Symmetry: C5
Subunit: 346 residues, 5 copies
């Protein structure tokens, strides 16, 4: 017999009237193309530009009666990736590409096989940098949901319809790990049918829940953010007579805590709303600032102190020192409870 | 009958004398091309290079009598995006491109349909990085106006005219949100007809008002910029005898405020004029510097103090301490009123 | 006779039925392609994106009976790199490309020679940026293993099989040096046969062990990380009466050590687990923090001190000063032993 | 009649012997090509790499007798930008390109019109990143001169000559503003004829004077650079008995001034010569360092002070304090005059 | 007669049997191609990636008897750069490209002329980013030697040999200046013949000595690195009774010197060996650390001081103060001599 390359020349050549500019089943029902992606590499999720780089295998399957051969004895004929400009292909595109490219390492990474009944498998490797609106109302304890939509651009709903297959619409790699987030096993599948001034177009999308890993932020901006508050608590255990001791403590600590506040949003987007890490530094900033005002109240009584009425001012300046050793270690603990409970339920 | 691919070969082939290098209605009136864009993604507005990345759908509509078919029973014939090099297309370009590229993810993102009367719709996806002169006279409270002009390069006014359509000249996406700014619903539409040494060319543009969100700057460079001034106010409530207490306070605070001034223009363009954030740090720098000179005036009187005339110098050195507790908390409030009123009207 | 260019036109032209879209030995055994790479340049191994740039010479050898000439008197015929689109080539690709490109400096860097029996050598220069999961459980003393897999995309196992040659499967350059790591002479060779929903494909890979050089981290983040702890030890040799001396020492040192902790993960990925450099700064942070609490215990006894019972409190406040000069210099040495032994065996 | 597309096929087709590989007026005088650029966008002038990005409209005009039509009734025939590979074009190139690209947004931005006498206008949009040797002998008050040369590569002087036109050789945009520098209205026009081992080639260039705007540097690195010196002057108004007051002032200020010196060359090229900003920080570093040595001379006399001869040492230690309040405020003013006069004339 | 474009069609057309896939002098001696480069732009030598960007004019000259015309009366025929795909060209490539590109600004920057005897000149503009192993054993006083090799990829030694010409093998631009380094006039020329598993290939290279300019490092990291040591010397001229004076001096200076050590390797590669700038900061770190231990020895004697034996401890605590004023100013000078002598000979 003849090889599949010469066998398909009768179906993709000048004979049989086959044209790559004509969609299958013309003047009839639209083409129902089913798609399924395979995430190979994931990560590099930046927040300054609010985008993430993904590498998926976009599989496409449809039905073309013009390529339904019945003379070849086999059931699957592989095609050279250099002959993709001869058959019709869906005009699939993403609405959040923001720059993309293919891979042509020694061969155009394309897969093309034709079944006997007319099933055509089209799998290619695409490297996308997808964008998603980052919701940072609770930055250290948020559940991001970055989606990706597959719309049409040249054909409307009556000519091309995208759908998901029931046999693993979205597969995940075996050893796919992320440096900062984690990929949940549950991925939603809903439609995203858009409507413009020209018409209506099909759209398919899949939700991806990306939960953060609190192990990183808990060590860098939570343990040092708590030890600095302890530095302001040791001033109560120091005598009220040493002026340079408690003054230098209430100033060097209250100024190095601002660096922690400025160092908590160094690589974060400039959002207007307040996040969960801005209420942890601001409240702890009040503790390192109230300790400065605490010494300002103790030193103000000692500098004012008549022999009987002045002996009570010394005890009054020391009575507040007996409560500050218990108030702040018990008030900061109350805020430490309302913080790790409210942001663990919402 | 015959498919539209073979039907349009009579209108785009060697027959009928149709050439892609000839504009419609030659030796007559110019081609009136109407355009309308659809902003899909917006943001990433940097200030060091004074540019912003945009992703729009550039729709183009004109009239070509050479493509006015009258035999096909339908009213809209979709075209393959691979056949855009056969018909005439307007030479539309932007005067502020500064690098651009198309999107060819599995298909050239182009839309092409031809009506019966000769209406040709041309919609493509372009990713532009547009530039605009940043007016930073009031940096935290400015209303930026970044525009984009669509000029001609090969045809003059007598051969190609660009205009805006009245049915939604500029559409906005449904869920288009910006991280730093906000997009106003009012967009101006005016002409930008340029004149060069070669001739005159058409030009269409649309204004985009981008108001900032003060919620970000109010927390990072306004709350810490005010608490440092309070650190210089607590020196008045400290006795005038402790030298290392008030000296270290008037130096560590006046030097950490300069870091806030240098940290306020870390990612800003090097403009010559003064902005609204440079007058907030410089005036607050005077308060943290006047407190240093305030102790220099109190300590200078105590070191100079004859038994009757010296008792008044001690009261004089304490009389200024009774006014500094009221002057600065009431003078900084006056500047706090004139600042948030002048920059809220202009 | 005729030159090899005209001699091979009979084997690569329209005659002999040779087609570049047909794999050798069709309807029979699969093509056994042996590959061997030659690493020219290596390094630039970043950790923020977890990727490294490599430049190898990908050699490919297979058997094509359709190109087995028997009339030319020579044994090796060199081919012009501009004629690679006429013969069949394996669709080799990498599963961790993440962007790649060729080199076309004055000539496409391709090698093509055909033997008499049908051996075809295919060598090209590819610049890859390969990714690997960075295991940073012990950051300064880890042995990274970055691999690279060569999979198929268009042909399954029954049509294309990749294998390694026994004569130097992976060669190393003569003067290939790395700035940070070192390349070990032992490189493992194992298979990576994947299985997808479409079928099974061949895969070959080679392990690369990249041991770090501790000479860099030992000087920058280990010598200064130890001298700061010595600054907290000198407070014991200072009299317990000078308050501003020991207070300023226990605060300026405990706050500059946090900068060393924040400066140890400035260009590191945001991992959740704790690494070996996070337990060296945190434990040393306890020493510079216990010295602050040590003075808080000595000053608390002196401020409390009845004529006979008060003379023992002065000796008690000095007895701890006689143990702190020996405890911390001997407790930090114990942690210094358990650290450099546990992380030198695992 | 026939359209210009079919009319010019007789002049650009196989007939008439017109070839795009032959320069006009062969075996005779060279082609005198006149050029004129139009700067659209300017700025982004970095100093680390010593380059600036420019966007100009390169117009080219020459004479081609082979295209001198005499049958068409019009005087200017516009050409499709897709037919630039049919006529001869000058091989113009820049000697300081360092990477460049064109703009192909929906159309190749090319202009091509042919006059009756043979005048051919060629205007294209080129985005260049031009380099210039940065002369930073006086960094805040220099007048940079970045030029751009247009050389030939394939034709020598006897075959191609570039010249400037007298009617606006270099035009400037109407609203072209720069963020840091300013563009002067005077632009020099001189030749740059080079000589290599192959021969001599034509060259045209234009000088661009880029004066800096001192409004930026005067606020960031000149006002804080002067207030720190004032902090060292207030130590003279403090009593000579307070040791921790004047010691901490002469150390915290002398160390934060070094940050201003290191912060003045953070984004500057590593040049060997000294600039005008390195002599302003180094001299001011002497003032904040002489104040430290001033207290070292006052405290050395007080610690040495026999009942009559010791009373003069106290007055001697205070006599220098009466001159330091007048010397430094009058010596720093002398350097402040010689600085803003020498660098305002050269 | 006929123009050179039509004259060379007889030598580059279907007639005469000329093929671009055949090297000259086949079945005979190899082609001796002589090359000579012309460095136009040089600099941008980074150290994090260990690469430098260069822009050279790669001239190539060989002998092709098939192009030896004898009928044209001239001696040099210029060729259009669009016809380089018709003649044979050497497959020259660099072994350290790491990404490269050509320049196509309005014309492919290629030079092609053919002599009567068969001499063919081939000059193109290539922008390379070449790599070299940075030897940083003495960072401020090293002599870097970055080379560039021109190897073959498709032809072995018996088919293509590269050589250097004796008439200026490597030329330098007239006004080529470097921001950091300097280019020496002496450039070595040696061979780099490599040997692989396939065979042996020709190779030509040229050495480039790049000496650093010490004027930059001497001001930024050598003058401030010496003044901080002077701050530790002034503590000896202060009385031994002021505790907060000498304690704060021996801590604030010893901690700001570590920033100079961390600030000396901010943009340097992470090498394991010690460089010449790491022994200048570490030794100076001992001086600012020995001054802290010097006060720890003086204060330890004063706190210990029986009426006759205690008067000698006061003199002993002051005797070391009389030697420290002379020891350190004379020991640091000894290290200052051995440093600037050992690194000025090797
Ligand atoms: C692609 O998928 C669409 C569905 O999304 C298919 O369209 C549906 O096709 C049926 C005929 O097969 C149309 O008729 C209906 O038939 C059912 C019985 O199956 C009957 O109960 C209904 O009353 C109706 O007559 C139906 O209108 C149509 N639906 C839509 C929304 O178009 C289409 O056939 C598929 N195309 C191919 C090539 O498989
Ligand atoms: C494209 O749009 C232009 C307008 O911007 C159209 O041009 C105008 O066309 C009219 C004829 O239709 C020209 O004549 C005028 O007619 C009015 C009555 O409608 C009459 O009152 C005037 O006195 C005049 O005779 C008019 O001069 C012309 N204007 C310009 C500025 O060119 C043009 O026809 C449109 N082209 C197409 C193909 O639709
Ligand atoms: C490519 O390599 C494969 C092996 O990976 C070759 O396949 C093996 O080929 C033999 C025949 O040569 C097949 O038959 C076996 O022969 C042995 C004797 O050599 C006999 O003991 C066995 O019982 C069996 O009959 C064998 O099944 C086959 N193995 C596989 C896994 O396919 C193949 O021939 C190679 N192709 C070329 C073109 O060299
Ligand atoms: C392109 O420009 C060059 C000048 O840069 C033109 O060349 C000059 O052409 C004249 C003839 O037109 C040559 O002859 C001279 O004529 C003058 C009178 O005009 C006479 O006084 C002189 O003694 C001499 O005979 C002249 O040598 C030549 N100069 C050079 C440097 O080539 C050239 O003609 C222009 N080409 C075109 C096509 O316009
Ligand atoms: C390209 O350069 C090579 C040299 O690198 C040329 O090869 C040498 O060519 C000579 C003949 O011209 C060969 O023969 C020798 O001749 C000398 C007298 O000149 C004689 O004393 C020797 O005993 C020997 O017979 C020589 O073997 C050969 N050397 C090599 C290494 O190949 C070659 O001819 C040049 N090609 C062209 C086209 O110019």
């Amino acid at each position: 017999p003849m090889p599949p390359s010469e066998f398909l020349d009768k179906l993709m050549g000048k004979v049989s009237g086959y044209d790559a500019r004509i969609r299958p089943n013309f003047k009839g029902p639209p083409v129902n193309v089913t798609c399924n992606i395979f995430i190979n590499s994931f990560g590099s999720i930046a927040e300054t530009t609010m985008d993430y780089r993904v590498n998926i295998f976009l599989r496409q399957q449809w039905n073309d009666p013009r390529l339904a051969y019945s003379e070849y004895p086999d059931d699957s004929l592989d095609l050279d990736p250099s002959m993709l400009d001869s058959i019709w292909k869906p005009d699939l595109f993403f609405a959040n590409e923001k720059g993309a490219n293919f891979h042509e390492v020694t061969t155009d990474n394309k897969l093309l096989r034709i079944s006997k009944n007319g099933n055509v498998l089209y799998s290619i490797r695409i490297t996308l940098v997808l964008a998603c609106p980052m919701d940072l109302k609770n930055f250290p304890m948020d559940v991001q949901t970055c989606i990706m939509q597959l719309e049409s651009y040249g054909f409307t709903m009556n000519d091309l319809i995208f759908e998901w297959d029931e046999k693993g619409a979205v597969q995940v790699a075996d050893g796919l790990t992320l440096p900062q987030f984690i990929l949940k096993e549950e991925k939603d599948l809903r439609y995203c049918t858009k409507h413009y001034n020209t018409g209506k177009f099909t759209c398919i999308e899949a939700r991806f829940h990306l939960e953060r890993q609190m192990g990183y932020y808990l060590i860098q901006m939570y343990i040092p953010s708590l030890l600095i508050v302890i530095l302001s608590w040791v001033s109560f255990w120091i005598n009220m007579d040493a002026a340079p001791a408690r003054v230098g403590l209430g100033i060097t600590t209250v100024l190095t805590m601002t660096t922690q506040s400025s160092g908590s949003r160094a690589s974060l987007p400039k959002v207007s709303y307040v996040k969960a890490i801005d209420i942890w530094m601001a409240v702890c900033l009040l503790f390192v600032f109230s300790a400065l005002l605490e010494y300002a109240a103790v030193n103000f009584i000692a500098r004012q102190h008549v022999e009987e009425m002045r002996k009570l001012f010394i005890s009054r300046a020391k009575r507040i020192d007996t409560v500050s050793r218990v108030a702040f270690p018990l008030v900061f603990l109350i805020f430490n409870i309302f913080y790790w409970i409210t942001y663990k339920i919402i």
